[PDB]
Symmetry: C3
Subunit: 445 residues, 3 copies
């Protein structure tokens, strides 16, 4: 079994079944903190070049802290916006009153610890960088003098190494208005992310999914700059929670269906509008119109429910009978008979109209299929490329069976004289109720 595909010659559409859902439904916010060192501008009387490198290094530390302070203005938000709303809610708790002392006390003994906030949110806190312990115990005795004298270059490089992460975090936040996605390694390293997942209150099997797909979790996470307060810098990393797992998913590919009679071009067209990803979800179906929202790993589909529409489960009847009386299947009518192709999971839909050259070829055996006027389909078995006019498409070399469901093209059932041929967002019954309107004008006059 695994990934299969069904093409409907009747409706010029294909369905890629066999996928398993993982759907984002929740968020887990985590507060990542960096201890900072509050220091006044010292005046080391000596002009030692070893110290001058430390002084200008310290200025980059000061400018980064100041840059982070200029982003706190940023945080107030509009309007939906709901993607980071759970993380922004945590930043507001960090302001009052003040809640930072509880994070300092918990991270005073360790680096990763759980903290309960004043609004009930129990957050995993992390201490990824301790700049305060460094600059005070190893840089303070160098500048806290008249003259400078004792200073080594290993401390200059050690400072640049411990500093660098901060500069990187500030740089990413600066050119992203305080919110970045995906979450970079500098925002949260893999060892920190893998440890963070293992400590989250989630299922034992949900941990293995996020651990086996850490690169996907980053692409669906947010890093939100919160406060800079009392020798502490804090930002929230908002991790996704997948409440819908292992339910079936299928991808719908649609292409224009037009009549191909010998006339100059006076033909009627028809195109299904319900293309996108579909996944069973809580007795209904979550529909994702923008395919760029879902990321497919192998046979698994990672989507965000916030970018989805929920349809009745009867929406799948359009893939069995477009004229079913249970669900009014969505179509659109026009006369734009321009050739195009869609590359499916295990094949390619080709809508060839006019004088366009539509072929499917093998890279060593030449052309193996030529498409006639109308909507057709070819499997990826033996095919390497698809050519429509002057643009070349590459067929997916994924293994799987393709089922060609032969059927009469639906557009042939309509009389072109009575056909409403410019419906932008209609449906099957919506076209039928308009055909009856035109027939009433003609017969009863």
């Amino acid at each position: 079994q695994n990934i299969t595909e069904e093409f409907y010659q009747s409706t010029c559409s294909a369905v890629s079944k066999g996928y398993l859902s993982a759907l984002r439904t929740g968020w887990y916010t985590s507060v990542i903190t960096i201890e900072l060192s509050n220091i006044k501008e010292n005046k080391c009387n000596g002009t030692d070049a070893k110290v001058k490198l430390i002084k200008q290094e310290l200025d980059k530390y000061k400018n980064a802290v100041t840059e982070l302070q200029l982003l706190n203005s940023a945080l107030s938000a509009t309007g939906s916006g709901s993607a980071i709303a759970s993380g922004v809610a945590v930043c507001k708790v960090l302001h009052l009153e003040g809640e930072v002392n509880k994070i300092k006390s918990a991270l005073l003994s360790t680096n990763k610890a759980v903290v309960s906030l004043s609004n009930g949110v129990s957050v995993l806190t992390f201490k990824v960088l301790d700049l305060k312990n460094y600059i005070d115990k190893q840089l303070l005795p160098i500048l806290n003098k008249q003259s400078c004298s004792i200073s080594n270059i290993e401390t200059v490089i050690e400072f640049q190494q411990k500093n660098n992460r901060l500069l990187e975090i500030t740089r990413e936040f600066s050119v992203n208005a305080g919110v970045t996605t995906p979450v970079s390694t500098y925002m949260l390293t893999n060892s920190e992310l893998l440890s963070l997942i293992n400590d989250m209150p989630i299922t034992n099997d949900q941990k293995k999914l996020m651990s086996n797909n850490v690169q996907i979790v980053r692409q669906q996470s947010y890093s939100i700059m919160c406060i800079i307060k009392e020798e502490v810098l804090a930002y929230v990393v908002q991790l996704p929670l997948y409440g819908v797992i292992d339910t079936p998913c299928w991808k719908l590919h649609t292409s224009p269906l037009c009549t191909t009679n010998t006339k100059e071009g006076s033909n009627i067209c028809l195109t299904r509008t319900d293309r996108g990803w579909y996944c069973d979800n809580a007795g209904s179906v979550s529909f994702f119109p923008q395919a760029e929202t879902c990321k497919v790993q192998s046979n698994r589909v990672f989507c965000d429910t916030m970018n989805s529409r929920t349809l009745p489960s009867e929406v799948n009847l359009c893939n069995v009978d477009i004229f079913n009386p249970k669900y009014d299947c969505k179509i659109m009518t026009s006369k734009t008979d321009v050739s195009s192709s869609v590359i499916t999971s295990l094949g390619a839909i080709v809508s060839c109209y006019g004088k366009t050259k539509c072929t499917a070829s093998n890279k060593n055996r030449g052309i193996i299929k030529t498409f006639s006027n109308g909507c057709d389909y070819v499997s990826n078995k033996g095919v390497d490329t698809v050519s429509v006019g002057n643009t070349l498409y590459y067929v997916n070399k994924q293994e799987g069976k393709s089922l060609y469901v032969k059927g009469e093209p639906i557009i042939n059932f309509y009389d072109p004289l009575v056909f409403p041929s410019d419906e932008f967002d209609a449906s099957i019954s919506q076209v039928n109720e308009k055909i009856n309107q035109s027939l009433a004008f003609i017969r009863k006059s």
Copy 2:
């Protein structure tokens, strides 16, 4: 007062009033220069590892300069494009003939100075990096020899520190075709940007707005690579000017309005198309259809006028009476009764149709409101989340009064048999003039 909100049950739309405009209307171009050092490839006879680090460091300097020279090809542009047209105009003045000597003479004594160009543009010039003074007075005597001998690692690190900014500037320009936005700290640091704002010929109050919102000025600025010429590298930072300030702004949220009779789904819908940001501007109204163009800070709305349409001030009458005879209010008709929600500034519009579960809940008190078939609205008072089907929305926790304007849903005034139910971009009178067309066909036959 401050931020308030009005919901119109009649038209399924809400207005978020109480905002204050800042609108970009102009540009201030500034030329940021880096003195470079023109050096031929020296052959230091010794293989000293301290010098080999300087030699490969110097190669990164040469490759960055060469990379900047490959971007000057880039600059010619199409086509609108008008965002950087004022900055590109300055780059063309820098080419002739040559104007760079005037920038060298002005920046020979200081770092920030005003320069008048050959085409009347008086530009604030900046000298942010002096690589020529460094490599000639501290790196030239090291390689300008047979053997190498005297060379310290502090000079190797000092070179990497003075170099780094340049490498960063070239890297950002390289992967952005010579134009970057927002303007990063490496393109122009905060102290440089804050100083640059204080020297601009603008109002005393306009300086405080840009100084208090430096992160917003960056997001609406452009860094444009100009020339590399005579031991000088120059690029233009194009800063925004806000000519419209403190005028009222309001955001319009619209949602589908459909009849909800018990039939299988044979209902007529209606949706206002004029959603977006609106701001009073010079006796008219600037309309921003793409909400992503405006950035809201607190009660202040930062927009770019180049991405806006100018409508008569009577367009606000659609928020008082959709049937007013002064302005033909824009709507669209369809039959897509699919449930959805819109999160407003101080609430949420919910369009619930069919069997979809539409609720609004508090995180500790449970469900506090359930939405019936039709278009309704709930305030953010006491509400934490909104659920429509399988997708969960977070309501904005901003403080403000919400006004529920009760009224008969406008869709109930239309006879479904005579209703043109697939108008993609129509209006109130446009639907009425089409209803009269259908009534003339039926009665006078």
Copy 3:
């Protein structure tokens, strides 16, 4: 000659002729390899600060390698997707079985060498970094001991310099799901890219085009992370091939055309929908609807054929006679008489309707042209800016002749009572066949 422009008052459209095509039609994949050093975690007994800097430096090397290993999960793909399909095909060959040994043997003696793969693809292989030779011959004898003793800071900096490129490559790949575009200098330096172009099996003249436009080749290239296998890291840089060169290209600008009678606003509009870039290509015309797909250098247009539609060459007849019986010209009808402007290559189209102030001005001479109600056009000769309402447009200061083709506005030929004024995607004959439908209802009743 060179760049010229023709404005059609009849159809409210302008054509920017005189451009020369370069069209992507193929891909050249190149495997860029970095030799890595497989090392177990040593325990240098001494706590030497010079070695502690090497140890933490070595950890960044280990984390980057681990980060690259977490991206190999990523590679499986959907669905079209065809942009990197030729590069993904090479990554799959690198997996079996194993093909990496052939790359090691070829790059054992040199750095750039040609390799023939097991699936016939002859790929240019590159060895841009030799970390294995460094860490084994200069870092292994430092940590491969009890105690540590001999260790210099020049080796610490040398390691950071040789390391840095790798960290950069991993960072870009990490936040881009293993595929980056444009190809940065760290993925492939200019000297490497210029050398790579010179060794490709392409025409002598095609090499000069890619060498003279290396910044454009990067913007149309892809860097694809392949495998990490046997002390080797490999990623594919997918370079564009331009099979269509020096064929004519022209850009079509369209704007709404509406009647301007004195009524309240009861006017009919008409707008050509076929705007975009057009280039002659293999006896047909490649049409690029999204202008952001093509990049114009001087008079040369760089486009990707995968983002194009192929139309019959008769599509240009709409720029000579919109009513020609050979090609049914695509238009759309509405009543949205809102003022707007389009900046062409050598002028500006202005659609002024209602009470909107539409002007074209010179920066020193003031207003030089005021636009009346209707669709007009002004050349860039003497014009600096165009004002429509509250938004200001900058006209392109490119040199070239503009031809004003006077003609009766096409919208004046239609009777508003019989005009179908809400066609979303129609054509000339499509509107005529609908006008005849309404005339049959009225006369034969």
